[PDB]
Short mmCIF file of C-alpha atoms in Angstrom, two decimals:
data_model
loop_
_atom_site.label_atom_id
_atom_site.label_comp_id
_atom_site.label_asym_id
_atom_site.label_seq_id
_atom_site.Cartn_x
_atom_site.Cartn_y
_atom_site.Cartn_z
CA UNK A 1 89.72 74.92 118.31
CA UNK A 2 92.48 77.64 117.30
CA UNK A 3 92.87 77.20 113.42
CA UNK A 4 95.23 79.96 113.16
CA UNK A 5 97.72 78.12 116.35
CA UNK A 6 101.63 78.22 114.40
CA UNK A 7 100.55 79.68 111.23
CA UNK A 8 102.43 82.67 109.14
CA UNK A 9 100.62 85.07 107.45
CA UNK A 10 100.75 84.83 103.98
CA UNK A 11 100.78 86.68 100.65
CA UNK A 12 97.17 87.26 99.65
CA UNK A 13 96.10 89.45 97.09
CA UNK A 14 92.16 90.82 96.56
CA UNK A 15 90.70 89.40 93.39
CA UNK A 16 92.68 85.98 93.36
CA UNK A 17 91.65 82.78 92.91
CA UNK A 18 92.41 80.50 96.26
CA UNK A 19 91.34 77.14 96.36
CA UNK A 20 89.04 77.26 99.19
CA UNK A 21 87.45 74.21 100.50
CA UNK A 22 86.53 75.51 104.03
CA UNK A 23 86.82 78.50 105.82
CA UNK A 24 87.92 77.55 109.59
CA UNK A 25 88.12 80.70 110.88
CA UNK A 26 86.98 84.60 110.28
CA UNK A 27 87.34 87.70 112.32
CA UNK A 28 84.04 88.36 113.70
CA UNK A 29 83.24 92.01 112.23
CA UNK A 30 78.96 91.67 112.04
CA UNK A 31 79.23 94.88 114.94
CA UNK A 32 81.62 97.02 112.89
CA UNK A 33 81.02 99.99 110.01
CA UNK A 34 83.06 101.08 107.32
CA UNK A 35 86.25 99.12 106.48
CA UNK A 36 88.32 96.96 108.93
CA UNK A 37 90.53 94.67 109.35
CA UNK A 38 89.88 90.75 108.60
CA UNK A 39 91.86 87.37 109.07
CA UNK A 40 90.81 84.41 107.59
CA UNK A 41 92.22 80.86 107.89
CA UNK A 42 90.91 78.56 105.65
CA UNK A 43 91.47 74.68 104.28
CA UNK A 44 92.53 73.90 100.84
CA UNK A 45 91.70 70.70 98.72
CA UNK A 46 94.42 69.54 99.37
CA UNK A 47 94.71 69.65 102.85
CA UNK A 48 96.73 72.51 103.86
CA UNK A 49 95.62 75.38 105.75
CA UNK A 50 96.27 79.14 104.89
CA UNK A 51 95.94 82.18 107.16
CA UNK A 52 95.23 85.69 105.53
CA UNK A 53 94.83 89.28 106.70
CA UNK A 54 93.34 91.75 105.03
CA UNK A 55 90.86 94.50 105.18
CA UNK A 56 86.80 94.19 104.76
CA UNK A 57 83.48 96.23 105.25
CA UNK A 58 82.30 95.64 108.40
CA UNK A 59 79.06 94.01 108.83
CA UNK A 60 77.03 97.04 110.16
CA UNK A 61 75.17 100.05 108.49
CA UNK A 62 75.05 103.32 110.17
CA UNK B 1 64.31 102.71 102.35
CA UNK B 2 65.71 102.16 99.56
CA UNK B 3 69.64 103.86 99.21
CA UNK B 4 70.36 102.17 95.97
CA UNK B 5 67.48 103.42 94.60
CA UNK B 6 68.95 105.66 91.21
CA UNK B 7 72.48 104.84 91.64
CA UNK B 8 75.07 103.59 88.93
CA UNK B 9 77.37 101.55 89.90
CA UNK B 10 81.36 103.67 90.48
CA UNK B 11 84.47 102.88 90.09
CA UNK B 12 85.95 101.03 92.78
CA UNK B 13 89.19 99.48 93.91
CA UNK B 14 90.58 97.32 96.69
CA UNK B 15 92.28 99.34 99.77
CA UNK B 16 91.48 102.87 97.94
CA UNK B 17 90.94 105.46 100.76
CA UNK B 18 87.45 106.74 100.21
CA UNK B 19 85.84 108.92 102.35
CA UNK B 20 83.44 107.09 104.24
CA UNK B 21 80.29 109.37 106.58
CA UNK B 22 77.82 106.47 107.19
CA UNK B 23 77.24 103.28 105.61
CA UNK B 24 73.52 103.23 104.64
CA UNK B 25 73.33 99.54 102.82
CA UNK B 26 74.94 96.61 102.40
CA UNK B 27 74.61 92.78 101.21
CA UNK B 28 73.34 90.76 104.14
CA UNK B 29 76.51 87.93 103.62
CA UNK B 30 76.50 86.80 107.29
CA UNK B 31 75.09 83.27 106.13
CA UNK B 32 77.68 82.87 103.36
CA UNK B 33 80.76 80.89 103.45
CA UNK B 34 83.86 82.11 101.14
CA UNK B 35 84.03 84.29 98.16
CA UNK B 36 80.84 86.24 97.33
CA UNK B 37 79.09 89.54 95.86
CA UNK B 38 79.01 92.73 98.10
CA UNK B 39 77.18 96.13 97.26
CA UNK B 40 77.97 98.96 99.54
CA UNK B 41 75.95 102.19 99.44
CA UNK B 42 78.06 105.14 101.46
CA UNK B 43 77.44 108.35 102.55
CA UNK B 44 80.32 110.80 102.10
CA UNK B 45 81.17 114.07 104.36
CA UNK B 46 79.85 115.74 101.23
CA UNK B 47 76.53 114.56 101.70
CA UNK B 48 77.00 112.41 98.34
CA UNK B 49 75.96 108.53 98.17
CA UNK B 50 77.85 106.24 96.33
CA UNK B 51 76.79 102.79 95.38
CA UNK B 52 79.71 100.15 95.01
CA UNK B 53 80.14 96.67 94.10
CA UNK B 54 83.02 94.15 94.77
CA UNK B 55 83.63 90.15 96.38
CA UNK B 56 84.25 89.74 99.88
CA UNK B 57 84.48 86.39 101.88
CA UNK B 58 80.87 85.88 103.76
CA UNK B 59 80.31 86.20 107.31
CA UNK B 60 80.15 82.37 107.91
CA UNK B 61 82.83 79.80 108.29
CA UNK B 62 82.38 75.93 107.48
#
């Protein structure tokens, strides 16, 4: 439904490993160019879920 | 056609301010789910292309 619903953003930190067992959610950014911003919560191994902002290339060329 | 085409690979880091025209190519990730490969080839105000690669999370959740 809302996977990001009572979640903090955490620390996250380009390059790092996460444990990632699903993604649940992602900013929709296929219309954009150049970089923007991106949230992501996603589902561990272990359960627990983790919501991250952050910035990404859009999913459009010019 | 073909932007790559001739282009070494530059320098690039996370959240460095670049200066960005037009984005003439990159990796079609919309089917991917977490962590994956991204080249980016830019046009600068220059008139210069630069081709870049780097990991972003793909366009796809679980």
């Amino acid at each position: 439904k809302d996977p990001g619903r009572g979640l903090p953003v955490e620390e996250y930190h380009y390059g790092m490993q996460l444990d990632v067992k699903n993604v649940l959610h992602r900013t929709d950014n296929s219309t954009r160019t150049g970089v923007v911003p991106v949230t992501v919560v996603y589902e561990d191994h272990s359960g627990e879920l983790h919501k991250i902002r952050f910035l990404e290339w859009g999913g459009s060329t010019s």
